[PDB]
Amino acid sequence: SAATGWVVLFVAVALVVWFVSLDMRHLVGPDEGRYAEISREMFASGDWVTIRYNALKYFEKPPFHMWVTVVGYELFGLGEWQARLAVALSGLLGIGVSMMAARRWFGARAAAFTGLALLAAPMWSVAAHFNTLDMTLAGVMSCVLAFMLMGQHPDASVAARRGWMVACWAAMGVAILTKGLVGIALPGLVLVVYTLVTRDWGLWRRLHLALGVVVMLVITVPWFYLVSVRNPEFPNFFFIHEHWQRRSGSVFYFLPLVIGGFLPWAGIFPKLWTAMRARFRPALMAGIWAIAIFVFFSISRSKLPGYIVPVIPALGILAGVALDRLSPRSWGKQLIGMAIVAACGLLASPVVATLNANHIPNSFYRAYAVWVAVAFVVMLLGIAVARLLLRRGVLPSVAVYAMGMYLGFTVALLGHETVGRPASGADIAPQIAQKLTPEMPLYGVQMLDHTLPFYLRHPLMMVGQADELTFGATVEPQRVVPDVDSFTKLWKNGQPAMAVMSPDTYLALAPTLSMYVVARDWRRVVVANVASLAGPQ
């Protein structure tokens, strides 16, 4: 316990950056806003069974992420960092259990390398600070893998093996309550593939199959029964609905995602392979985890980046052992390569200053470019001081390097606030809230705004195409305007209300109905049907 004062320092500096950075960006739609708002509505209603999005049934996802977010709301009230609490705790959880399994099978030093690996991995840290279900599922599934590895260690008693096995099945249950059957399909897949490569059938006896299935059913079934009974249309939807938004992604879709999301360790990607090929083989289990899940999502029709996040913890374990075998000169090689590519990021950072996308003007991206450049600069600093610390050992150099990378990608994420804040609509929320009341409708005229209703603490009344709310709009049609043509009669003859639409929608409806503009930004026009709810015009 000589240099423990460094570790305590390191982790401390990590944790404060881990949580403070949560509350420094406005919510980025659709995901962050969608789950923050669903959780808000659950929090305000108390109905933890029937998930609703803008007062409409939302049966596209299971509720565990929302349960966690709602507990967070009850403890610390509504806000940005509270809405991102589930994913941050999921990230810490993946780090923790990952280096627990690493410490069990490969020792303390390798476990430290695993924690550093997951910390520096931009996919794990970014995804850990971005409110989406993929990081929650990644943390609970990392509990599946880690608990499975803990339970298969020979030096554990039958009581410990059963404890880690029921812990594994329980984690699979939570995962099913997080994003559906994936939480059990991917493990089983990774399981059978394993038993085909190693030809160890007796492993199916160590799983505690009966007890684990029973405890998993006890965890998952109650909510599914409740929501299926209260809403008979739920099971056919959740298990049959082919969801799609506005697919067609190549089989190489997740290749730049996995490479970029594990970038500070890309140079040792071969040394990860030579980590698994070289009774129970844990590194091989992690490798079959990452590879099997990767090829599973790579051959799937629907592809989203977050799908691939659950492979990162396993990679972390592999990284932990690979870095554990490196001499000082080899890590020097890695530092040289990463210094090169980070310097290329610094030279290429002005590229984003020439961007304008998602109806966000170029200026915000000019302000993003300086933050990206700063990010690669702090990466370079961390690399330099790591090279200075290489004389004291590989582990301190890797620790400083990983800290530099983590702070770097953290700066790169916080810099996204430049383009995320004008899109969130939080700026024009106070202007709207001055005249908008909770009993007033806020029509969404063919626009599913994912962030503004959260900031208004006020749900949208969907008008016309409800997008992913279509299903909800059809099973409870008394809560929704079916088409814009009915919205015109509601608008000219109904109660005083407001409406959110796109600018092109405003110009399309302008010759039809006169509307007084309450607020505008680059992505939305907010109007009222009475002149007294807006500024002079």
Ligand X SMILES: C[N+](C)(C)CCOP(=O)(O)O
Ligand Y SMILES: CCCCCCCC/C=C\CCCCCCCCOC(=O)[C@H](O)CO
Near ligand Y by CB under 6 A, which window of 79-87, 111-119, 296-304, 474-482?
111-119
Q: Total residues contacting ligand Y (rule CB under 6 A)?
A: 27
Q: Examine residue 60 and tell whether it contacts ligand X (CB under 6 A).
A: yes
Residues 6+ away with beta carbon under 8 Å from 492: 513, 529
243 is in an annotated binding site: yes
Report the site for Cl ion in 450-469 (rule: CB under 5 A).
457
Choose, by CB under 5 A, the member of 7, 15, 44, 185 that binds Cl ion. Answer: 44
How many Å apart are CA 89 and CA 92, to the nearest integer? 5
Q: Give the x/- contact pattern for ligand X in 161-180, rule: CB under 6 A.
A: -------------------x
Q: Give the x/- contact pattern for ligand Y in 144-163, rule: CB under 6 A.
A: ----------------x--x
Element containing residue 308 per DSSP (H, E): none
User: What region does 270 belong to: left with phi over 0, alpha with psi -120 to 50, or beta?
Assistant: alpha
Report the site for Cl ion in 201-230 (rule: CB under 5 A).
none
Near ligand X by CB under 6 A, which window of 63-71, 113-121, 234-242, 515-523?
234-242
Near ligand X by CB under 6 A, which window of 105-113, 233-241, 344-352, 420-428?
233-241
Range list of β-strands (E), 222-268? none
| Partner whose footprint covers residue 420, from Cl ion, Zn ion, ligand Y, none (CB < 5 to 8 Å by kind) | none
129 is in an annotated binding site: no
Near ligand Y by CB under 6 A, which window of 5-13, 277-285, 309-317, 369-377?
5-13
Sheet bearing 498-501, strands edge to edge: 461-463, 442-445, 498-501, 525-528, 516-520
Q: Examine residue 181 and tell whether it contacts ligand X (CB under 6 A).
A: yes
Cβ count within 10 A of residue 252: 9
Least spacing, CB of residue 67 vs ligand X, in Å: 17
The CB-based long-range contact list for 267-272 (8 Å cut-off, 24+ gap) reads 267/333, 267/334, 267/337, 267/338, 268/319, 268/322, 268/323, 268/326, 268/334, 271/322, 271/325, 271/326, 272/315, 272/318, 272/319, 272/322
Q: Examine residue 236 and tell whether it contacts ligand X (CB under 6 A).
A: no
How many Å apart are CA 303 and CA 190, to the nearest integer? 19
Least spacing, CB of residue 228 vs ligand Y, in Å: 9
Residue 47 half-sphere exposure, CB side, CA atoms within 13 Å? 16
Q: CA angle 101-209-169, nearest 5°? A: 45
Q: Examine residue 171 and tell whether it contacts ligand Y (CB under 6 A).
A: yes
The total number of residues shown for the chain amounts to 537
List residues near ligand Y by CB under 6 A: 3, 6-7, 10-11, 14, 95, 112, 115-116, 119, 140, 143, 160, 163-164, 167, 170-171, 174, 235-236, 239-240, 395-396, 399
